[PDB]
Design a protein around this ligand. Structure first.
Ligand SMILES: *[C@@H]1O[C@H](CO)[C@@H](O[C@@H]2O[C@H](CO)[C@@H](O)[C@H](O)[C@H]2NC(C)=O)[C@H](O)[C@H]1NC(C)=O
Ligand SMILES: *[C@@H]1O[C@H](CO)[C@@H](O)[C@H](O)[C@H]1NC(C)=O
Ligand SMILES: *[C@@H]1O[C@H](CO)[C@@H](O)[C@H](O)[C@H]1NC(C)=O
Ligand SMILES: [Mn+2]
Length: 568
């Protein structure tokens, strides 16, 4: 199969007949996991979904067996240590364990530095960077009030001064206030307030408000009863839920619907669709299995989290009108819109690890996609504009497929197609793995500070509550169940099978079906991603014990370790 644009194909009546058959058999079926994007239906849509699920099953079985072996080992070791009767006992949950299912190990520094405020705040700029926003001096009010004396001891200034200087930031999970909780499961609905401290030039936590029950406000000065430490725990619990259900819409639902629109309008012979098919490897396995293995009643999610299934579906439906917007989710557009990059109303964040690694990856991807588009369309914008199948795709996405905020048609320049395909590659090869893939087990779901559920009521009092936080955290057993669940979202075999971001474009069918310019661009991409992978693998702590300004080694965007596709 040598790929052809429609005008290059002398076999074109049969080509178009094939596309009309796809259009009769590959339909827009109901959205899965809530009110997001359509899912493939009809006989062909069912067969595509089934094909993907069937391929996915093999690595899922192998990996689950690995995770259960590792789990039995770790549980033996927690038994020899006499259980989990302290916070610092939780290290036994990870020490020398999970070598089979999580061979990259837990992110260094997570367990060792788990009380660090700077770690807690910098996680909002790394492990889940999709909630934080800067507070505009005049267009945003303060999310809540904080004791003036407390603020001044903490900051040597005031909230009005920091707010006016554009140095305040907020991560707001208060939408969880009135969620249903499962019996004997609890959670708050925290709003966390952060600031960029002019003294240390560090992005630091300032206050956490639960927004539930007694609706109390916490601060690093609340050292009594381990209150502040617990508040962070509560926030992380909310935040983990956010990051995992956020990623249902972004990347999964968006990529799925954009690609479904392409499958209905472009030939299998089309170079662009073949590229997209590579990026979307196994993608349509995720939401069906989510319905029946993960989010079912009930159900591994329900067995480890604090909310029932209909709250997951509620969150998806509530967030998709925003998080499903295609152009709004381009890397730069999103971080600028939230005021974290190029903000005119506040100082630049000194360290933003997600944006640093992410923007570099986007540039490497874009160099490849620019060469791909140039070779395919012979350096001609008119050839893009005259590609009837490409234009059919864009109109299908903007119309019957219901893609939100897609690129408006017609799409008449190479540059715009480059933006679209670069963003697809970003979604399947990078963003997915910032939020999901190995990120939870290695960082954002690391116990004790990131439990998937709480096990005692959120305190109604600062003074009259227990100083022992073990009642809220999962037990010795439920910790092993949590780490097992999150370990089953890792896929180590992408490394030995070269199914990683580094080899995203090195597909045999793409190398054979495109010309020599394709191969040369692939070679450049593979080399660049290999160098970035070498750098990420080599990250170490500096003299102050800080990697990328953080008390932990963040390797979630190592191109040599993460899939090129939406693997789980
Ligand atoms: C976070 O925990 C890590 C453990 O990996 C600490 O790492 C050490 O950091 C010092 C510098 O402070 C280095 O000289 C050591 O070589 C590091 N050890 C290892 C095994 O990497 C790190 O200091 C901690 N960071 C903070 C801020 O507490
Ligand atoms: C024309 O396209 C159809 C559909 O793929 C195929 O069966 C036929 O062999 C093609 N003809 C040539 C000469 O490639
Ligand atoms: C993986 O890719 C490298 C090229 O960088 C190659 O040397 C190796 O043989 C490949 N392994 C497999 C299984 O594809
Ligand atoms: Mn996923």
């Amino acid at each position: 199969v040598v790929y052809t644009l429609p005008c290059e194909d002398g076999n074109s009546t049969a080509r178009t007949a094939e596309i009309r058959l796809k259009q009769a058999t590959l339909l827009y079926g109901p959205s899965l996991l809530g009110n997001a994007s359509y899912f493939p239906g009809g006989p062909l849509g069912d067969a595509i979904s089934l094909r993907d699920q069937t391929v996915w099953e093999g690595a899922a079985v192998v990996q689950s067996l690995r995770a259960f072996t590792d789990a039995a080992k770790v549980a033996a070791n927690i038994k020899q240590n006499g259980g989990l009767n302290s916070l610092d006992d939780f290290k036994v949950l990870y020490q020398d364990g999970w070598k089979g299912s999580v061979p990259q190990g837990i992110a260094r520094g997570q367990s060792e530095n788990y009380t660090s405020d700077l770690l807690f705040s910098m996680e909002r700029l790394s492990v889940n960077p999709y909630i934080l926003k800067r507070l505009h001096p005049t267009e945003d009010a303060l999310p809540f009030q904080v004791d003036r004396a407390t603020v001044k001891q903490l900051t040597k200034t005031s909230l009005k001064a920091l707010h006016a200087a554009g140095r305040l930031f907020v991560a707001d999970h208060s939408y969880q206030r009135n969620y249903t909780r499962l019996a004997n499961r609890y959670s708050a609905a925290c709003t966390a307030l952060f600031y960029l401290d002019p003294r240390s030039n560090q992005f630091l936590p300032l206050a956490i408000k639960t927004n539930v029950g007694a609706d109390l406000t916490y601060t690093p000065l609340d050292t009594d009863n381990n209150n502040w430490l617990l508040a962070k725990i509560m926030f992380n619990n909310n935040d983990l839920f956010h990051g995992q259900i956020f990623h249902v819409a972004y990347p999964h639902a968006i990529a799925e619907i954009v690609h479904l629109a392409a499958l209905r309008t472009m030939s299998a012979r089309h170079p662009v669709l073949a590229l997209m098919e590579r990026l979307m490897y196994q993608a349509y396995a995720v939401r069906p299995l989510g319905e029946r293995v993960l989010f079912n009643k009930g159900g591994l999610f329900e067995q480890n989290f604090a909310y029932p299934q209909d709250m997951v579906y509620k969150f998806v439906g509530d967030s998709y009108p925003t998080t499903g917007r295609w152009r709004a989710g381009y890397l730069d557009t999103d971080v600028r819109a939230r005021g974290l990059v190029d903000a005119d109303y506040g100082p630049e964040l000194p360290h933003f690890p997600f944006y640093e690694d992410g923007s570099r990856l986007v540039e490497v991807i874009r160099r490849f996609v620019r060469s791909f588009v140039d070779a395919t369309y012979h350096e001609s914008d008119e050839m893009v504009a005259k590609d009837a199948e490409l234009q059919a795709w864009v109109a299908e996405a903007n119309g019957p497929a219901g893609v939100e905020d897609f690129e408006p048609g017609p799409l008449d320049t190479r540059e715009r197609l480059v933006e679209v395909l670069t963003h697809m590659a970003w979604l399947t090869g990078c963003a997915h793995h910032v939020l999901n893939q190995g990120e939870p087990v290695t960082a954002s779901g690391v116990l004790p500070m990131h439990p998937t559920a709480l096990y005692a009521p959120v305190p109604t009092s600062k003074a009259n509550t227990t100083a022992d936080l073990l009642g809220y955290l999962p037990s010795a057993q439920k910790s092993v169940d949590q780490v097992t669940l999150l370990a089953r979202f890792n896929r180590p075999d992408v490394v030995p099978t070269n199914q990683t971001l580094r080899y995203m474009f090195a597909a045999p069918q793409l190398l054979l079906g495109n010309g020599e310019a394709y191969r040369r661009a692939n070679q450049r991409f593979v080399r660049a991603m290999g160098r970035i992978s070498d750098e990420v693998k080599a990250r170490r702590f500096d003299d102050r014990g800080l990697s990328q300004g953080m008390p932990f080694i963040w390797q979630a965007l190592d191109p040599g370790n993460i899939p090129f596709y939406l693997s789980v």
